[PDB]
Amino acid sequence: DAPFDAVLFDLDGVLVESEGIIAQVWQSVLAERGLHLDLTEIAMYFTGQRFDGVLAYLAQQHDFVPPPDFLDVLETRFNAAMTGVTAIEGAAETLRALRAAGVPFAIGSNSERGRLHLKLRVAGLTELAGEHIYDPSWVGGRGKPHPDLYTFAAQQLGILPERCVVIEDSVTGGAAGLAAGATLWGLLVPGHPHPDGAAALSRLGAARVLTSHAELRAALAEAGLLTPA
Ligand code: NA
Structure with a gap:
């Protein structure tokens, strides 16, 4: 499995x-x-x-x-x-780990494209984030919570959305991942605000709600995508 x-x-x-x-x-x-x-x-x-x-x-x-x-x-x-804007603690390490393991990933954001890339740049994540970076202009403006952006991101990786895990901190984005057919893992790093809380993400249908990038990497290892550390 x-x-x-x-x-x-x-x-x-x-x-x-x-x-x-x-x-x-x-x-x-x-x-x-x-x-x-x-x-x-x-x-x-x-x-x-x-x-x-x-x-x-x-x-x-x-x-x-x-x-x-x-x-x-x-x-x-x-x-x-x-x-x-800064990188979320642990985020660069998660991207680096996925890249070292050869796991396909993409970013889907409701940010306008310029702002999306500006944020990755100032956070120091541009090189790690790669080229599969999608904003609503790639799907005719039909951003989250429509599934379109995550359906498209999965398509671009050549992977079925049903076989993806979506990492989100809001109902708006979590809903887009679920509506695309993906599994939703909520991620709510404390010390930073998020648009919704753990109870809402769980009720929405998140299969889990994680609280750190360290926990995310541990979960990804349990799912066979990374090596348990
Ligand atoms: Na978000």
């Missing part, structure tokens, strides 16, 4: 740390303007929300309406901040 032929990776939260950096920008721009929120609230409610929606939330939940310069300053600073 060898369950998998290939690994399909999420980007944000699994290979690179971006949601925490974005949360810090919200927190500082707001704090400067009088409203002091904690990073967990910001990560939970602000990240991956449309700007008008953030304004509605601020008004409804905090009786707060930001000053005119709010949009401009946020943009100026999300831009400057994107350079500060």
Whole structure:
């Protein structure tokens, strides 16, 4: 029983740390303007929300309406901040191990293509990540949670999606992997925010929920893809 032929990776939260950096920008721009929120609230409610929606939330939940310069300053600073994206601890080692073992893998991200590659670059992962790196523009904009991106990634590796394992930190991305026919392993590295928690990923249908790249490599070894260490 060898369950998998290939690994399909999420980007944000699994290979690179971006949601925490974005949360810090919200927190500082707001704090400067009088409203002091904690990073967990910001990560939970602000990240991956449309700007008008953030304004509605601020008004409804905090009786707060930001000053005119709010949009401009946020943009100026999300831009400057994107350079500060880092690799998730252990991620480079997982990619290096898979490459040494000759296991096919691909990355599937809802990031716009330029940003996807910028993040891999500043995180120091470009060489390790390889060339099977897919954003929604490869599937006509039908990004996660549609299965299309992971179906396509599997196709590009010449492997059936049913024989892939998808490593994801959100319901949005986990759903895309399951809908493609893959097995879902949640990965929630602590110390970094993720869009959903372990209970949600398990209820969604993750076969497991791992909490470190060391645990991921151990699981991949149990599945016959790496050597147990
Ligand atoms: Na993610």
